Symmetry: C2
Subunit: 459 residues, 2 copies
C-alpha cells in the first residue's frame, strides 16, 4: 500500500513556502517553526531569486555538507592550522565570521561574508558568540553553520586586530608577503592597508589561503561589485542588482522558536486585523534622552506628506495599524494620542502599537521581523536596525533624514533609492591606478547612500 | 433596541448627540429591564420638567419666590468634586427629585455641558447662568445660614423660601438628619433646595418610610437604581463620544471577549507597585478572567481573542500584563492583547475611559473607586473587586465578586430616627448591606 507514489505530498520547489526556490525543502519543521511559516504572515515577494542564485545555493549546501564542521574533511583541514605554511591544496577552504558588534551589524555583515564565501568557493563558519544559536535556526540543510567550540583559534578572536602579525593589512603595510590562515580586519575603523581586501590582485593572493578569519561590522557587499571577476558572477547571481540582501538575508536568517513566538503573538494580538500596516522604525542618535519634539514633527510631517498616515481634523473605512519601534515610547504615545483625540480627515481607523521601550536581543530580533511584515515602512537614517527590517521585507523605505542641530529636516523624509542596506565605511581606492577615487561615481548601480553620504549602496 | 426597553424617549435630535442612540452598536443589550412604573415616572418627570424648567413662565414666577403655595418645586445640584463623584451624586439627587416631585437643575460647573448631552426631551437641565444664588455656591457649607444642619443646630427651625443641604462626606449628625422621615416632611415644603454632595446617597433613601414604598415600585430589582438612572441621565457629547468610538474601533472591536481592569491605587508614591501587579495577575487568573502563561517548551494541541482594557493613572500595570503575554505562550492558546488609553481633554478622556470600561464583558475594579462604580453601573456589570491593600501587601484573596453592580455609599448616617439613637444601618433590611470594599459603606443588593 505504497502510496507516496500516486499521491505524493510532492512539493513545488519554487512554491511560496520555499520563497520561490530560495529555501530547500526537507528541514525538520518542528525545530524551526518560522522557516516555512514566513508565508502565513508576509505577502510573497515580487522579487524572484534567479535560477543561477538557486543553483548556487543548492551547490553551496553540497559544499557545506562535504566540508562542514565535524566532517572528516573539516578535521583534516584543521591540521593545516598547525604550521604557518601548507604543502599543497587541501580540499576545502573556509571563511570564519567572528561574532562582533550589534545585532543589526551582525546580520548584515554575516550576510556579506556569506556572499563572499559564495564568490570564493569557501564554506562559511559562524562564531556563535554569546547568542547566535539562541536567535537563529540552521540555514544549511543537513549541516550546522556553527564554528565548533573547540576551533583552535577562537580564544584569539577578541584580540585580533590591525597590528596582529596575521592581519592581512599588517602584512601589506610592513611589506611582508602560502600561509595557512589570514585575519582580515574589516571593522569600520580599518585603514588603507586593510582596505586592500577590496582589490582584485589582493583577492588573488587571499584566494590561495585555506582559512580566513573575518572581523567586520559593515555591510560590505557593494564594494564586491567593483572587483573584476566578482562583478561577472554577481551580475549572474543577481539580475536585479539591489536584491542581494533581500535574497541572502531571507535565505540565511530564520528566528528560533523562542524568538518566533514573540513575532507571532505580537502580530496575532495587535496587527492581524488591519487592512494595512505602516512601520515606523525610530532611532535617535543622541546622548540626551528623548523624546524630541523635532523628531516627532519629522515623523508627523513625513507620514502625512507621503500619504502614509492621514491628517486629522482638529476643527466602511479601512483599518490601518501603525507599528512603531523605538527605545523611547514617546513617539508612539504622541501618534497614539493624536489619533485618539481627533478624527481622521479621511475617515480611516488608525491604531498605534509599540512592542517595547527601554531576552533583549530576542526582542530586538522579533521587532526587526515585525517591521519586515509591514506594507510600507519608514526608517531612520544610519540605522542598521532599519536596513535589516527593510531588507527582510523587500521594502523600499521612506528615510527619516538625520536632523542637524535638533531642527526638523526639510524635507522630513524621502523615498529610498532601493531596499538595500548601506555600506557605511567603503574604501575609496582605485586598485589599478593605485590612487584615490570616488567609488560612488564609477558605475550606475553603486551610488552614495541617501542617508550617509560617505557610504555606498546598490541601486 | 435604541430606547433601552423604554427607558429613553424617542424624538431627540440624533446628530446633536450621536451617543444617545448610536451606542446600541457598542454594547450588548442589558438584561435588566426598567419596570413599567419607572418608565411612567420618567415620562411624567419630563412633563413636569417641560412645565417648570428654566425659561418657562412658571420658572420665572418661582424665581420671584426666592426674593424672600406655588406650583413648582426644585432641587439644584452644585457641581462639586471629581467626575466619578459628580455622576453618582447627580444620579442620587435626580432620584431624590423623583421621590419629592421636584425639578432637577444642574449647575454646569466648568464642564458638565461639554461632557453630557441634554437628558430631558425638549427642555434643558442646566441651571441658567443668571440664577441669583450662583455666586454663593462655592461658599455654601455647614456654616451657611440657610444650611439645614446649621438650622437644626442653632435650633432656628412661615415656610422658608430655600434651604441648603450639606451632604458632602464631611457632614455631621445635623446634616445627616436629612435622612430622617420627619426632616423630609419639613424639607418637603421648601420650594428651592440646593445640594452639595460627593456621595452616592441612594441606599439610605431606601430606609426612609414613604420613600421606601415608592422605591419598591420604581425598582422591583432593587440593585438596578444607578444602572437605569445613570443610563437615562448620562449621554456623552459628540466630542467625548468620538474618543469612545475611535478607541473602540482601533483597539477593541475584533476581540471575541473584552476584559476591563480598572486600576486605582490610593497611595502617595505614584508607583507602580509590584504588590498591585501581583494582586491583578492573581485575581484575573484565579477567577478565570485571563489565562495563565507557562514556560513549557513542548506545546499542546481556532483561538479566542481577548482584549484587556486597562485604565490607570500609571502605565506600569498594563505594561506588566502586556510584557507577560508577549513573552510567554498562554496555557489555553488564547490570544491576549493588552490596551491602555492614557497615562499621567482630562475630563473628556476620564468619561470616555469610564465609558469604554462599561463596554467590556467582565470587569475588575479597584476598592473605593467611584471611577469603577460608574463604569460597572453604566455597563450593567457586576465586577470583581480588587480589595484595598494594606502595608503594601498583596491582599489575600486578591479580589472577590461584588454583591451587585450598584455603587457604594461611602458616608452613610448610622442613626435610628425613631429611637433617636445610633444604629448600624447596614443591618436593618436584607437589600441594604455593607459594601465589599469599604466596610462602613452601604449598597443595594
Ligand atoms: Cl589589484
Amino acid at each position: 500500500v505504497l502510496d507516496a507514489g500516486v499521491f505524493p505530498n510532492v512539493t513545488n520547489i519554487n512554491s511560496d513556502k520555499l520563497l520561490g526556490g530560495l529555501l530547500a525543502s526537507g528541514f525538520d519543521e518542528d525545530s524551526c517553526l518560522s522557516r516555512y511559516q514566513s508565508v502565513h504572515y508576509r505577502k510573497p515577494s515580487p522579487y524572484k531569486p534567479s535560477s543561477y542564485l538557486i543553483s548556487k545555493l543548492r551547490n553551496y549546501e553540497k559544499l557545506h555538507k562535504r566540508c562542514g564542521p565535524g566532517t572528516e574533511s573539516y578535521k583534516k583541514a584543521l591540521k593545516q592550522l598547525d604550521q604557518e605554511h601548507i604543502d599543497g591544496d587541501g580540499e576545502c577552504k573556509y571563511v570564519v565570521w567572528i561574532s562582533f558588534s550589534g545585532l543589526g551589524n551582525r546580520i548584515l555583515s554575516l550576510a556579506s561574508v556569506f556572499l563572499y564565501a559564495l564568490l570564493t568557493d569557501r564554506v562559511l563558519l559562524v562564531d556563535r558568540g554569546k547568542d547566535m544559536d539562541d536567535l537563529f535556526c540552521e540555514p544549511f540543510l543537513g549541516m550546522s553553520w556553527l564554528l565548533p567550540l573547540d576551533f583552535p583559534m577562537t580564544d584569539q578572536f577578541d584580540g585580533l586586530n590591525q597590528e596582529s602579525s596575521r592581519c592581512y593589512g599588517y602584512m601589506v603595510k610592513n611589506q611582508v608577503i602560502t600561509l595557512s590562515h589570514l585575519y582580515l580586519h574589516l571593522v569600520h575603523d580599518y585603514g588603507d592597508h586593510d582596505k586592500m581586501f577590496f582589490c582584485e590582485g589582493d583577492q588573488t593572493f587571499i584566494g590561495k589561503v585555506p582559512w580566513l578569519i573575518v572581523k567586520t561590522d559593515n555591510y560590505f557587499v557593494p564594494s564586491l561589485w567593483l572587483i573584476p571577476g566578482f562583478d561577472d558572477e554577481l551580475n549572474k547571481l543577481f539580475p536585479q542588482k539591489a536584491t542581494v540582501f533581500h535574497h541572502l538575508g531571507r535565505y540565511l536568517f530564520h528566528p528560533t522558536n523562542q524568538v518566533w513566538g514573540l513575532v507571532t503573538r505580537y502580530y496575532e494580538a495587535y496587527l492581524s486585523h488591519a487592512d494595512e500596516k505602516i512601520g515606523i522604525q525610530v532611532r535617535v542618535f543622541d546622548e540626551d534622552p528623548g523624546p524630541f519634539q523635532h523628531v516627532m514633527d519629522q515623523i508627523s510631517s513625513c507620514t502625512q506628506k507621503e500619504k502614509l498616515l492621514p491628517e486629522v481634523d482638529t476643527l466602511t473605512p479601512k483599518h490601518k495599524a501603525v507599528l512603531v519601534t523605538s527605545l523611547n515610547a514617546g513617539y508612539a504615545e504622541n501618534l497614539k494620542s493624536m489619533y485618539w483625540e481627533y478624527p481622521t480627515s479621511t475617515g480611516e481607523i488608525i491604531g498605534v502599537h509599540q512592542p517595547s521601550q527601554e531576552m533583549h536581543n530576542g526582542k530586538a530580533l522579533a521587532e526587526m521581523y515585525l517591521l519586515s511584515l509591514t506594507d510600507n515602512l519608514v526608517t531612520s537614517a544610519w540605522s542598521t536596525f532599519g536596513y535589516v527590517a527593510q531588507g527582510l521585507g523587500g521594502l523600499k523605505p521612506w528615510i527619516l533624514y538625520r536632523p542637524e542641530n535638533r531642527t526638523t529636516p526639510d524635507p522630513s523624509c524621502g523615498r529610498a533609492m532601493s531596499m538595500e542596506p548601506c555600506f557605511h565605511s567603503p574604501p575609496f581606492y582605485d586598485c589599478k591606478a593605485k590612487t584615490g577615487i570616488d567609488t560612488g561615481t564609477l558605475v550606475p548601480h553603486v551610488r552614495h547612500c541617501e542617508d550617509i553620504s560617505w557610504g555606498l549602496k546598490l541601486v
